[PDB]
Structure formats: structure tokens, C-alpha cells
Structure 1
Amino acid sequence: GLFGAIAGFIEGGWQGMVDGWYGYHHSNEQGSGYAADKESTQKAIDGVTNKVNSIIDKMNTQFEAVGREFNNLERRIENLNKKMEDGFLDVWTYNAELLVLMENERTLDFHDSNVKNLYDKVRLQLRDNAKELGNGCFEFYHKCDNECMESVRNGTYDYPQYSEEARLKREEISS
């Protein structure tokens, strides 16, 4: 992980989530459950769908072509064919083989990036109203029910609403 998401602080991935690529795990008073963020997942797929498209679509330059047609009193020219034909085969194989290797590293890192940005989007909404575990989770200081948590996902979470509930829960532990 370049961004320290996937290999890093989120050791392993939720297997029970099968809605999207990136998402959340709520465990409040009503119950537990996974819930995937479809909006960020969609942008990733829009992106990846476009990479793969672009690697095929740009090579549209291809035309007519042929094989071999010289007698054994013109082996010199047949050797010139071989040099060229082997030559291109070398270039295309190399360029292809590497293109894969290069675009595969960045594709994996694009996912790391999206996950670290999602974790950061949650982190910035609830500054001192929750506790950064370091396993990439957030322990709430106040009670937040199923209707409260849609606000975190939606991104409409009010800091001032639950400010005093947490702030005065903080000194209770600090003894």
C-alpha cells in the first residue's frame, strides 16, 4: 500500500461486504451490519472502466497485413523480412508486458488512495466527537443510532448537535 490503507492500518478486508469496493461497519445498540459506500465505488469503477478502455481503444491503428513469399535465390530479402518481423514482435511484447506491470501497480494504489480518502472524509467530520482507534475504526463518545449514522455516510453530520455529550464524557474517563 502506497497510501498505507490496505496493507497498512486496515490489516485485511471485510469479506461480508459484497455491495461495493469500499465501505462501513456499524455496531450500535440496534445491531451490527455492513453497508457499502456506492458513490465512491462508482467513481473508482468509472475510472478503471476507462483505463482498460483507453489501453485498447488507442491502438485502433491497425490495417492490412500478410505472410511470406520469396524464393531461395532471394534469401537476403527474406532475412530482411525476418529482422523487421522479429523486431516488432520484440517491441510489442516488451511494451505490452511492461504496460501491464506499470498500470497494475498504479491501479492497486488508486484503491489504497480511495480508501484512505474515505477514512479521511469521516475523520474530518467528527473531530473530537469520536476516538481514532488505529485499526481504522471510530469509537463514539456519544450514543449514535441507525438514523444518526446515515448522516456520517451521507456526509451531513452535525458537530454542534452532539458536542457537549462527548466533551463532558471525556473528563469522566480522565481521572
Structure 2
Amino acid sequence: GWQGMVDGWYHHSYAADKESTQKAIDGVTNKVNSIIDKMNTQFEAVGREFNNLERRIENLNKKMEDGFLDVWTYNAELLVLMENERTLDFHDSNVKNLYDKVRLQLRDNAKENGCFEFHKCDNECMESVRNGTYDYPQYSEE
């Protein structure tokens, strides 16, 4: 993809799509927000308060301390790995969804690299492509 595009996350024959970038930045921010905020934190005290003649209960506390570490680590690791592809495949869709958004917009006014060669088309003609307000019958016969 393009490296010089800092406007956001089109190219003219750059200006990033302000709509899909706003829908993406707001959405992925909400996913990290829900991952952190859904956690429930309560006051707990850990201190190993059993003497050497209470070692059986000391082992019972171990089995639950060690048991919870096994559960959280497996969930946290797999949640990271599962949501990362769902994020990296979420970006595989936005390109083709923005491609078809413009492809189905101008139907026969150009020829299909994710690029289109158009009738010649100016700045006001391509800023209308980004807006979603592209007038097809204005350049239909050409």
C-alpha cells in the first residue's frame, strides 16, 4: 500500500477516505475499550497466612492461585491472538469494501491494482468520488 498517506488510514490520476477512516478508528478504539473495561476488579488480599502445620490448606490456596493463573493466561493469550487476526482481517475487508464502494459508484466510466483509469477527471471530479456523490450521467456517454 501507499506509505506517504498520512491524511488517514484514495489516489488520483492523495486524500484518505474520511468516512471509512472515522468508522475504523472509532470502532477499533471501542474494541480495546471493551477488552479492558469489561474486567471486574475486586479487593483481594494474598499473603500466605498458613503455618507449616497447615500445609494442606496452604496447598489448597496454591491450587486456586495456580489455577487462576492458568485460566487468565490462556484466555488473555488467546484473546490477543484471536482478536489480532480479526483486526488484520478487518482491514482486509475495508480495502475491498472501499474498492466496491467506488467501483459500483462509477460503473462504466473507467476500467478496473485497486486503481481505475477513467473521460478525463479533475479535482472537483475526484473529490466527488470520495464524497460518495459522484454523478454518473454527467460522464456516461464519454
Q: TM-score range by the shorter chain?
A: over 0.9
SS in 2 for 1:162: coil
- Of 33-42 and 152-161, the range deviating more from structure 2: 33-42
1:65 shift after superposition: 2.4
Once residues 65 and 94 of structure 1 are traced to their aligned partners in structure 2, the CA distance between those partners, rounded to angstroms, is 23
CA-based RMSD: 2.3
* Percent identity over paired residues: 98
Note the alpha carbon deviations across 1:38-97, whole angstroms, 9 max, x for none: 211011111111000000100134332222111111111111111110000000100110
Deviation at 1:158, TM superposition (A): 1.2
Rounded Cα–Cα distance in structure 2 between residues aligned with 1:64 and 1:70: 17
CA offsets 1:100-143 (integer angstroms, 9 cap, x no match): 000111011111111111000000011111000xx110000x01
Q: CA deviation at 1:18?
A: 0.7
TM-score relative to the length of structure 2 = 0.94
Quick one: distance in 2 between partners of 1:66 and 1:83? 14
Q: Quick one: distance in 2 between partners of 1:15 and 1:80?
A: 56
Separation of aligned partners in 2, 1:145 and 1:55? 45
Match of 2:132 in 1: 155
Aligned mate of 1:15, from 3, 28, 35: 3
Q: Could you tell me how far apart the structure 2 residues matched to 1:137 and 1:157 are?
A: 17
The normalised TM-score by structure 1 is 0.77
What are the ranges of 5 or more consecutive residues in structure 2 without an aligned counterpart?
A: none
For 2:125 and 2:55, locate their aligned partners in 1 and report how far apart those are by CA, in whole Å. 81
Q: Please say if 1:112 is aligned against 2:92.
A: yes
Greater than 6 Å deviation, 4+ residue runs:
none
Q: Name the structure with the higher strand share.
A: 1
What is the DSSP-based 3-state SS (H/G/I as helix, E as strand, rest coil) of the residue aligned with 1:64?
A: strand
